[PDB]
Design a protein around this nucleic acid. Structure first.
Ligand SMILES: [Mg+2]
Ligand SMILES: [Mg+2]
Ligand SMILES: [Mg+2]
Ligand SMILES: [Mg+2]
Ligand SMILES: [Mg+2]
Ligand SMILES: [Mg+2]
Ligand SMILES: [Mg+2]
Ligand SMILES: [Mg+2]
Ligand SMILES: [Mg+2]
Ligand SMILES: [Mg+2]
Ligand SMILES: [Mg+2]
Ligand SMILES: [Mg+2]
Ligand SMILES: [Mg+2]
Ligand SMILES: [Mg+2]
Ligand SMILES: [Mg+2]
Ligand SMILES: [Mg+2]
Ligand SMILES: [Mg+2]
Ligand SMILES: [Mg+2]
Ligand SMILES: [Mg+2]
Ligand SMILES: [Mg+2]
Ligand SMILES: [Mg+2]
Ligand SMILES: [Mg+2]
Ligand SMILES: [Mg+2]
Ligand SMILES: [Mg+2]
Ligand SMILES: [Mg+2]
Ligand SMILES: [Mg+2]
Ligand SMILES: [Mg+2]
Ligand SMILES: [Mg+2]
Ligand SMILES: [Mg+2]
Ligand SMILES: [Mg+2]
Ligand SMILES: [Mg+2]
Ligand SMILES: [Mg+2]
Ligand SMILES: [Mg+2]
Ligand SMILES: [Mg+2]
Ligand SMILES: [Mg+2]
Ligand SMILES: [Mg+2]
Ligand SMILES: [Mg+2]
Ligand SMILES: [Mg+2]
Ligand SMILES: [Mg+2]
Ligand SMILES: [Mg+2]
Ligand SMILES: [Mg+2]
Ligand SMILES: [Mg+2]
Ligand SMILES: [Mg+2]
Ligand SMILES: [Mg+2]
Ligand SMILES: [Mg+2]
Ligand SMILES: [Mg+2]
Ligand SMILES: [Mg+2]
Ligand SMILES: [Mg+2]
Ligand SMILES: [Mg+2]
Ligand SMILES: [Mg+2]
Ligand SMILES: [Mg+2]
Ligand SMILES: [Mg+2]
Ligand SMILES: [Mg+2]
Ligand SMILES: [Mg+2]
Ligand SMILES: [Mg+2]
Ligand SMILES: [Mg+2]
Ligand SMILES: [Mg+2]
Ligand SMILES: [Mg+2]
Ligand SMILES: [Mg+2]
Ligand SMILES: [Mg+2]
Ligand SMILES: [Mg+2]
Ligand SMILES: [Mg+2]
Ligand SMILES: [Mg+2]
Ligand SMILES: [Mg+2]
Ligand SMILES: [Mg+2]
Ligand SMILES: [Mg+2]
Ligand SMILES: [Mg+2]
Ligand SMILES: [Mg+2]
Ligand SMILES: [Mg+2]
Ligand SMILES: [Mg+2]
Ligand SMILES: [Mg+2]
Ligand SMILES: [Mg+2]
Ligand SMILES: [Mg+2]
Ligand SMILES: [Mg+2]
Ligand SMILES: [Mg+2]
Ligand SMILES: [Mg+2]
Ligand SMILES: [Mg+2]
Ligand SMILES: [Mg+2]
Ligand SMILES: [Mg+2]
Ligand SMILES: [Mg+2]
Ligand SMILES: [Mg+2]
Ligand SMILES: [Mg+2]
Ligand SMILES: [Mg+2]
Ligand SMILES: [Mg+2]
Ligand SMILES: [Mg+2]
Ligand SMILES: [Mg+2]
Ligand SMILES: [Mg+2]
Ligand SMILES: [Mg+2]
Ligand SMILES: [Mg+2]
Ligand SMILES: [Mg+2]
Ligand SMILES: [Mg+2]
Ligand SMILES: [Mg+2]
Ligand SMILES: [Mg+2]
Ligand SMILES: [Mg+2]
Ligand SMILES: [Mg+2]
Ligand SMILES: [Mg+2]
Ligand SMILES: [Mg+2]
Ligand SMILES: [Mg+2]
Ligand SMILES: [Mg+2]
Ligand SMILES: [Mg+2]
Ligand SMILES: [Mg+2]
Ligand SMILES: [Mg+2]
Ligand SMILES: [Mg+2]
Ligand SMILES: [Mg+2]
Ligand SMILES: [Mg+2]
Ligand SMILES: [Mg+2]
Ligand SMILES: [Mg+2]
Ligand SMILES: [Mg+2]
Ligand SMILES: [Mg+2]
Ligand SMILES: [Mg+2]
Ligand SMILES: [Mg+2]
Ligand SMILES: [Mg+2]
Ligand SMILES: [Zn+2]
Lengths: 99, 208, 83, 99
RNA sequence: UGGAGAGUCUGAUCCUGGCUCAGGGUGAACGCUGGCGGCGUGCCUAAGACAUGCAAGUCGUGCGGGCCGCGGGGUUUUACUCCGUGGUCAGCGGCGGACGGGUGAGUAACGCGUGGGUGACCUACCCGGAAGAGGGGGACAACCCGGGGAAACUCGGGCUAAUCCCCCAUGUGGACCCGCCCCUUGGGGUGUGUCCAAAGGGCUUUGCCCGCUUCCGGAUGGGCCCGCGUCCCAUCAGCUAGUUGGUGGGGUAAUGGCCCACCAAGGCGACGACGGGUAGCCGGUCUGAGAGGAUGGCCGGCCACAGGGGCACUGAGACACGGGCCCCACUCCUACGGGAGGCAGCAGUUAGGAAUCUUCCGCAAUGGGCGCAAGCCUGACGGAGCGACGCCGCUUGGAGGAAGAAGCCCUUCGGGGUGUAAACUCCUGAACCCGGGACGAAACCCCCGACGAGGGGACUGACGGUACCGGGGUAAUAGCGCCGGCCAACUCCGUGCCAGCAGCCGCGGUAAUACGGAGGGCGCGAGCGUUACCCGGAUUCACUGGGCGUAAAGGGCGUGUAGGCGGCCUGGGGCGUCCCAUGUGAAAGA
């Protein structure tokens, strides 16, 4: 089976490409608590269909370019920017804690 | 090579009669007779209360020195007993009692342990028709432990089997005295042995 | 070419071979595709050769090439006997 | 010293020139054909595209282009000819291509 | 099926707390000691430098010759010339030098592990199936001729064969553009058009064997892509210009900023970016009650490299350890113009080092390369050698033998100890001598049968006259550590804060069981101690399994971002969670 993932689009600014953020839940290998990691994937959007805040299913594909090995399957849930605002705010926090 | 030297000196240090000498441990010369105290200059001095390790140590030697085995083969036999299913205590004894050199003595073919060792080592013992010259060879239940007809005319063999006439053998053994045969029926149980050794003491010696 | 041959698993002066399907390029004791039997040359046991012919018959269909010694043993278990 | 594996090296330079020669022919003819297609001569570009194709499939007969490598150049050629032949098309010879 | 503790801070106590010890482990080294054999193992440092030898070749059943020789021919003789044959050498051509073998440098990475994708692909030889091989043409070596150079070698001219190269045909079929159909990323089919096939050799020469060509499929091997896991430092916090994406092209077996042009301004980071340090990774191994910690030698799998760096050629396959080109360092030859090299292949030398082996036998076995075969090659491998380096088995005697010799040791001077230990009596018979003497080996081949099944027959050893069996047969190596407590074993003399012991606490400054010797004793025993290193005890990084009032430890206080956490009732979903089936979890190990 081609690996399939479900995540939220956090970036519209590329051409024919959207950045999809896929969370992951799994218990810690020693300390046993449930931890939530996440990883951004570069998805291929040929028709520029999907927008910011859309929750989509991503699927393992023949590589389109560097860093782009996944295509967008279908739109699960449309337009929930709260998931995007959660990402922006954390990214915005890195302007502090420098000097 | 196993320990070779004064033996009835070790009858004394253990405080218990050690029949490694064969005869003369029965006659009142064993030096367990009228000399039960340990050897050395301080043997007659009052002994201090032994430490909890002191007791465990002496009990192992009391058992090990009885079969006449180096600690190397001894320890390995223990580590084998702990893994197998059953009571580590009794299983270890049955494994010692399965030593060919020990079975030879137990069968009365030889007077002592050391003597039964030499009889095996020189090939005078037959196991199921073949010669077996290894004292460490483990006998399985049902094997026939015989005397090589090459040695059946030896005066030392006809000597010990002469006193074995009418003598009874252990319940896990049986022997034909004329044809100089013998058979290992089953592994002896804890009750089958009268060895003056607490086995839990020896196990407790190895937990450390 | 995929071959059928032996692999030495015994000890010094005590050889024990594993009749084995492997690519000719791998080591004679290296990784192999499938273990299709064993061979005791010194004939120390009552059963010193076993094959599972119908498996050996498969690999000959897909083009495995047996050694002269492998073919000799395969014939002894009747891989080629066609009656 | 003096291993006769040097015999292989001596042959290597033989085959070197052979492969090099055929390739320089493929390229020079292909560029000559696509020149005419761009220049609108429909017959001459076709009469050349044939010999280019024949030279290609002949190179694959040996150890030069053996794989689908021959097909790529054959594919790329017939497309660019037909494409460039779309400037007052009139595919005169019509030999190499399909109706 | 499995879990032990102890010493040390006080005058004494409890607690906290570090240190230390008993246990196991090692590719070990060192000290003393050292008998036999089996199986393992053996440069951990300089990926430093290497003498010499060997480590990849084979095919005359692809082709034409050179040299040395023999025989038979055309001739009256000669000259010249034809044919067969033997040796030998390379050359042209085919297959293999990409496997096998070595190393751990570089790599923190799709390198490895694990589970998947390939509608984005390749695969020599082998197997199955379909089909075909018609005609013509040409060159380069060998060889012959000339020249240059000290050499390595190199330049020019001429003749020639082929399973070398080329043209045309035949189109089973395949390739390509375009259309159509079905599938759905480049998968399959179909149509028109265009393009593409080939080689002979051998005989028991009318038929068969070794080969050749196109296509489809299998098998095996592999490329690329993805989820996840993969050491320390935040006293590394910001990184990034082909960098992120797009369109088109180049290149590849094949996707892709892999490369190129142009366009857009993006991509990554506190869930550790970037940098720095360190390191091949795993199966496993050691340890541990376990969780865990440590490690990756040997063997097996993957990877990376071949003096350092870069590069391609040839090919199914390499950017190639024993192939090529170039730069650099080093060593050798040099006629100073220029050349030859590359043990991290097996031994072996040197250097470094505490430390790591023979310049051994063999093609008999197994495996690989080439060949119709016979056979050839194989420092892969199988064996031997050395080293207690590890494991295991085995010997240095067995039995009788004094209320108990000598000597040494202590003594209450009565005696006690070494001690059945020795002497000595009897029996056995490690070594060693003599004879027999292997398994590992049956195919390949030959013969019958059709070169099949099947049957039949014959040659074939390193180890090695070793293993083993039978006979003969001698009493025939013991060592090392420790004895104040943990910790098992005590007295005397010697020395007087000296000489020294010491893992920790501590001993010795005139009676020392702690120093040094003796007697004696304890522990192991062909070993015994030691040092280093790993885990253990250590619940002393506490997930299992700890703490912060005064012992080490609450931030000076607040606000609040991210994150972590979430009252009661119903319902959908079924991500976490739980259950069943299945695939996987190589082999070895355990
Ligand atoms: Mg967009
Ligand atoms: Mg693109
Ligand atoms: Mg889609
Ligand atoms: Mg910023
Ligand atoms: Mg145990
Ligand atoms: Mg069980
Ligand atoms: Mg048990
Ligand atoms: Mg019984
Ligand atoms: Mg234990
Ligand atoms: Mg391989
Ligand atoms: Mg068959
Ligand atoms: Mg029949
Ligand atoms: Mg039939
Ligand atoms: Mg050649
Ligand atoms: Mg040109
Ligand atoms: Mg190529
Ligand atoms: Mg038990
Ligand atoms: Mg239980
Ligand atoms: Mg139970
Ligand atoms: Mg357990
Ligand atoms: Mg103190
Ligand atoms: Mg105290
Ligand atoms: Mg205090
Ligand atoms: Mg004090
Ligand atoms: Mg403590
Ligand atoms: Mg230790
Ligand atoms: Mg050896
Ligand atoms: Mg090294
Ligand atoms: Mg050789
Ligand atoms: Mg010839
Ligand atoms: Mg003549
Ligand atoms: Mg005539
Ligand atoms: Mg003449
Ligand atoms: Mg001729
Ligand atoms: Mg000749
Ligand atoms: Mg030749
Ligand atoms: Mg090479
Ligand atoms: Mg290799
Ligand atoms: Mg090695
Ligand atoms: Mg790094
Ligand atoms: Mg990094
Ligand atoms: Mg992976
Ligand atoms: Mg990764
Ligand atoms: Mg994988
Ligand atoms: Mg010609
Ligand atoms: Mg010709
Ligand atoms: Mg010439
Ligand atoms: Mg010429
Ligand atoms: Mg044609
Ligand atoms: Mg057709
Ligand atoms: Mg057509
Ligand atoms: Mg021809
Ligand atoms: Mg050809
Ligand atoms: Mg396949
Ligand atoms: Mg990572
Ligand atoms: Mg650019
Ligand atoms: Mg592109
Ligand atoms: Mg544009
Ligand atoms: Mg992350
Ligand atoms: Mg490194
Ligand atoms: Mg364990
Ligand atoms: Mg770890
Ligand atoms: Mg690791
Ligand atoms: Mg390794
Ligand atoms: Mg390099
Ligand atoms: Mg080097
Ligand atoms: Mg290099
Ligand atoms: Mg090739
Ligand atoms: Mg390479
Ligand atoms: Mg080399
Ligand atoms: Mg050399
Ligand atoms: Mg030195
Ligand atoms: Mg060796
Ligand atoms: Mg062949
Ligand atoms: Mg050779
Ligand atoms: Mg070897
Ligand atoms: Mg006396
Ligand atoms: Mg005696
Ligand atoms: Mg005698
Ligand atoms: Mg044999
Ligand atoms: Mg035989
Ligand atoms: Mg042969
Ligand atoms: Mg015939
Ligand atoms: Mg036959
Ligand atoms: Mg011989
Ligand atoms: Mg004998
Ligand atoms: Mg003696
Ligand atoms: Mg101890
Ligand atoms: Mg004590
Ligand atoms: Mg001392
Ligand atoms: Mg004095
Ligand atoms: Mg004093
Ligand atoms: Mg004194
Ligand atoms: Mg003293
Ligand atoms: Mg002393
Ligand atoms: Mg002493
Ligand atoms: Mg031993
Ligand atoms: Mg520790
Ligand atoms: Mg712990
Ligand atoms: Mg614990
Ligand atoms: Mg600590
Ligand atoms: Mg906790
Ligand atoms: Mg819990
Ligand atoms: Mg605490
Ligand atoms: Mg405090
Ligand atoms: Mg406060
Ligand atoms: Mg404070
Ligand atoms: Mg809740
Ligand atoms: Mg929540
Ligand atoms: Mg579920
Ligand atoms: Mg397994
Ligand atoms: Mg198994
Ligand atoms: Zn006694």
């Amino acid at each position: 089976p081609k690996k399939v993932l479900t995540g939220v689009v956090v970036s519209d600014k590329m051409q024919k490409t959207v950045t999809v953020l896929v969370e992951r839940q799994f218990p810690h290998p020693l300390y046993g608590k449930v931890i939530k990691r996440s990883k951004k994937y570069l998805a291929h959007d040929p028709e520029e269909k999907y927008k910011l805040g859309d929750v989509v299913e991503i699927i393992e594909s023949r590589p389109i370019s560097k860093r782009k090995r996944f295509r967008v399957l279908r739109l699960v849930e449309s337009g929930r920017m709260d998931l995007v605002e959660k990402y922006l705010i954390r990214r915005q926090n890195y302007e502090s804690l420098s000097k | 090579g196993r320990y070779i030297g004064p033996v009835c000196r070790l009858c004394r240090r253990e405080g218990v009669k050690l029949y490694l000498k064969g005869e003369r441990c029965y006659s009142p010369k064993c030096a367990m007779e009228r000399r039960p105290y340990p050897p050395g200059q301080h043997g007659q001095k009052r002994a201090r209360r032994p430490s909890d390790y002191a007791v465990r140590l002496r009990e192992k030697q009391k058992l090990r020195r009885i079969y006449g085995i180096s600690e190397r083969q001894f320890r390995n036999l223990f580590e084998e007993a702990s893994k197998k299913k059953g009571v580590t205590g009794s299983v270890f004894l049955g494994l010692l009692e399965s030593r060919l050199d020990n079975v030879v003595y137990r069968l009365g073919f030889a007077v002592s342990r050391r003597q039964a060792r030499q009889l095996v080592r020189h090939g005078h013992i037959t196991v199921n028709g073949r010669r077996v010259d290894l004292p460490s060879y483990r006998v399985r239940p049902g094997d026939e432990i015989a005397v090589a007809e090459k040695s059946r005319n030896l005066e030392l063999i006809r000597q010990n089997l002469e006193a074995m006439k009418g003598r009874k053998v252990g319940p896990w053994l049986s022997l034909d005295v004329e044809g100089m045969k013998g058979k290992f029926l089953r592994l002896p149980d804890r009750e089958d042995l009268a060895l003056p050794v607490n086995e839990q003491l020896v196990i407790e010696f190895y937990s450390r | 070419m995929v071959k059928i041959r032996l692999a030495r698993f015994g000890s010094k002066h005590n050889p024990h071979y594993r009749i084995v399907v492997t690519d000719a390029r791998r080591k004679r004791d290296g990784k192999y595709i499938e273990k299709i039997g064993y061979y005791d040359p010194r004939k120390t046991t009552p059963d010193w050769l076993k094959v599972d012919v119908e498996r050996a018959r498969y690999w000959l269909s897909v083009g495995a090439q047996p050694t002269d010694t492998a073919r000799r043993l395969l014939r002894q278990a009747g891989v080629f006997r066609q009656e | 010293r003096n291993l006769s594996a040097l015999k292989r090296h001596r042959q290597s330079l033989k085959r070197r020139l052979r492969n090099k020669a055929k390739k320089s022919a493929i390229k020079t003819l292909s560029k000559k054909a696509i020149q005419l297609a761009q220049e609108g001569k429909a017959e001459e570009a076709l009469k050349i595209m044939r010999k280019a194709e024949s030279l290609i499939d002949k190179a694959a007969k040996g150890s030069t282009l053996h794989k689908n490598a021959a097909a790529r150049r054959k594919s790329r050629l017939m497309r660019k000819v037909r494409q460039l032949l779309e400037a007052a098309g009139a595919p005169l010879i019509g030999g190499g291509l399909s109706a």
